[PDB]
Amino acid sequence: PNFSGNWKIIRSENFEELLKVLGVNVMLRKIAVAAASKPAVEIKQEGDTFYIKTSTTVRTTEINFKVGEEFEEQTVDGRPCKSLVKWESENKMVCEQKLLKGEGPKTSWTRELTNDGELILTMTADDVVCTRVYVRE
Amino acid sequence: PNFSGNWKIIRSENFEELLKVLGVNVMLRKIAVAAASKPAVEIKQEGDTFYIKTSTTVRTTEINFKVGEEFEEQTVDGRPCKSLVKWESENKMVCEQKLLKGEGPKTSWTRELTNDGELILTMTADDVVCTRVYVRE
Amino acid sequence: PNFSGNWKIIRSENFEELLKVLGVNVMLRKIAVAAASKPAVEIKQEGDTFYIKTSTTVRTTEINFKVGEEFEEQTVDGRPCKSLVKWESENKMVCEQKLLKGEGPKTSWTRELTNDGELILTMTADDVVCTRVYVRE
Numbered sequence: 581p582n583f584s585g586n587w588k589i590i591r592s593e594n595f596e597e598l599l600k601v602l603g604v605n606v607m608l609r610k611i612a613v614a615a616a617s618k619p620a621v622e623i624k625q626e627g628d629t630f631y632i633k634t635s636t637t638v639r640t641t642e643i644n645f646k647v648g649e650e651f652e653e654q655t656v657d658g659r660p661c662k663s664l665v666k667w668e669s670e671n672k673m674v675c676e677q678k679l680l681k682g683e684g685p686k687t688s689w690t691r692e693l694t695n696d697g698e699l700i701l702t703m704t705a706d707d708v709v710c711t712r713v714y715v716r717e
Numbered sequence: 718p719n720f721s722g723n724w725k726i727i728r729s730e731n732f733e734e735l736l737k738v739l740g741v742n743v744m745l746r747k748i749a750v751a752a753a754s755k756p757a758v759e760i761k762q763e764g765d766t767f768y769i770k771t772s773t774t775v776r777t778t779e780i781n782f783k784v785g786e787e788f789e790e791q792t793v794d795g796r797p798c799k800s801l802v803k804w805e806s807e808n809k810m811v812c813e814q815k816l817l818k819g820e821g822p823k824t825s826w827t828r829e830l831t832n833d834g835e836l837i838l839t840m841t842a843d844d845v846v847c848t849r850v851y852v853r854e
Numbered sequence: 855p856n857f858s859g860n861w862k863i864i865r866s867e868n869f870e871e872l873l874k875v876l877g878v879n880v881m882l883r884k885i886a887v888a889a890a891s892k893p894a895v896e897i898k899q900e901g902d903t904f905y906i907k908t909s910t911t912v913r914t915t916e917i918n919f920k921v922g923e924e925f926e927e928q929t930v931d932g933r934p935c936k937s938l939v940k941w942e943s944e945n946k947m948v949c950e951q952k953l954l955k956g957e958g959p960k961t962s963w964t965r966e967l968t969n970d971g972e973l974i975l976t977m978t979a980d981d982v983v984c985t986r987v988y989v990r991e
């Protein structure tokens with residue numbers, strides 16, 4: 581496997597629908613959709629240790645985590661949560677998220693490495709799944 | 718008293734009117750209004766020493782200050798200023814702001830802790846006062 | 855010469871046209887145009903060593919470089935590039951940019967100090983030149 585690399589997006593579906601579900605307002609959703617159009621994803625994997633940077637021209641996020649070990653990050657909409665990543669399999673990690681404070685839709689995300697040079701990111705907010713596909717830059 | 722805690726907003730009035738006064742353009746005002754809708758305020762008080770973080774999905778500000786002692790921050794619209802906070806009373810601090818460079822409307826802000834679990838933030842730009850009320854998250 | 859100082863803008867032309875050329879989408883272009891309206895440029899020069907901070911209420915960039923020595927920054931649109939600055943003359947430095955990864959329009963920027971208290975910034979994206987003029991704040 582090895583997720584390491586710079587990734588660029590090629591396909592995306594249900595991203596706005598996912599934001600609507602998380603109650604992001606129309607103005608913020610418009611900015612998010614425009615910015616998520618050309619992100620730059622940098623991933624660094626050394627064993628079960630990952631570093632994932634996701635840059636856009638308006639908002640950038642960086643996560644550091646070790647698989648199977650709980651850590652703190654934020655939901656797509658900017659809410660702080662407790663996250664635990666695990667290997668569903670050799671090439672697919674799954675992440676369950678739990679909100680530190682407040683109520684909200686149930687969220688998670690998965691990252692998978694295909695055998696043909698793609699990285700698939702799925703993000704779920706209750707019953708809405710956004711799928712984004714990337715290739716090495 | 719003790720301002721410490723995570724606060725969420727419940728009421729707000731005259732925020733856009735305040736921005737208009739500070740000459741913020743319509744596009745920026747629209748983004749500001751959309752982002753200020755659900756901020757996350759983190760406050761840490763240890764004596765007369767405060768740390769106030771105000772996060773939104775687009776722009777986040779952090780201030781560190783000791784009451785009665787001049788420090789450097791920015792106006793709501795992003796202009797650098799010299800600020801001095803003082804206790805108007807036991808539960809209310811007042812902040813006078815003076816622009817480092819340039820001319821502009823006279824600005825200030827006050828934070829007050831009520832006896833019923835609310836934090837009140839007022840922000841003034843000349844004769845416009847924006848009032849925002851928060852409760853513990 | 856000596857570029858050091860805080861600069862405010864007085865004139866600007868072709869900024870949106872330049873962004874269109876770089877393929878920035880309409881939403882991002884609208885936000886960029888609104889934010890670039892009142893930036894705050896801080897420049898620090900100690901010999902051939904420069905530090906240029908450009909703040910706006912939405913996005914801020916900082917570059918550190920030594921003239922004639924290659925360094926890493928980003929294009930106006932947020933793309934990482936290898937940059938080498940050189941003195942075209944006593945009061946004018948020129949910067950050629952080369953994209954780390956991917957294809958794109960040919961970009962560069964120049965900064966010039968006039969004899970009447972202005973700083974001129976030109977930015978080029980292929981055959982579009984944006985000119986921005988500043989004065990000391």
Ligand SMILES: C=C1C2=C(C[C@@]1(C)C/C=C/C(C)=C/C(=O)O)C(C)(C)CCC2
Nearest residue numbers: 608612615616619634638639657658774
């Ligand atoms: C500019 C963005 C904004 C948001 C999310 C983001 C970051 C766009 C998302 C990009 C992704 C998810 C890229 C990727 O992973 O390919 C919010 C919803 C908080 C709203 C504020 C602006």
Ligand SMILES: C=C1C2=C(C[C@@]1(C)C/C=C/C(C)=C/C(=O)O)C(C)(C)CCC2
Nearest residue numbers: 745749752753756771775776794795911
């Ligand atoms: C996104 C924001 C923007 C601005 C202010 C802010 C930060 C919204 C303010 C939130 C507040 C005041 C929250 C609170 O204190 O509850 C500016 C005017 C610079 C314009 C650019 C975007």
Ligand SMILES: C=C1C2=C(C[C@@]1(C)C/C=C/C(C)=C/C(=O)O)C(C)(C)CCC2
Nearest residue numbers: 637882886889890893908912913931932
């Ligand atoms: C808010 C800005 C945005 C952009 C550029 C910038 C930074 C506006 C530029 C200001 C300049 C060039 C100021 C100056 O130098 O006077 C992008 C195109 C990435 C799009 C996202 C928002």
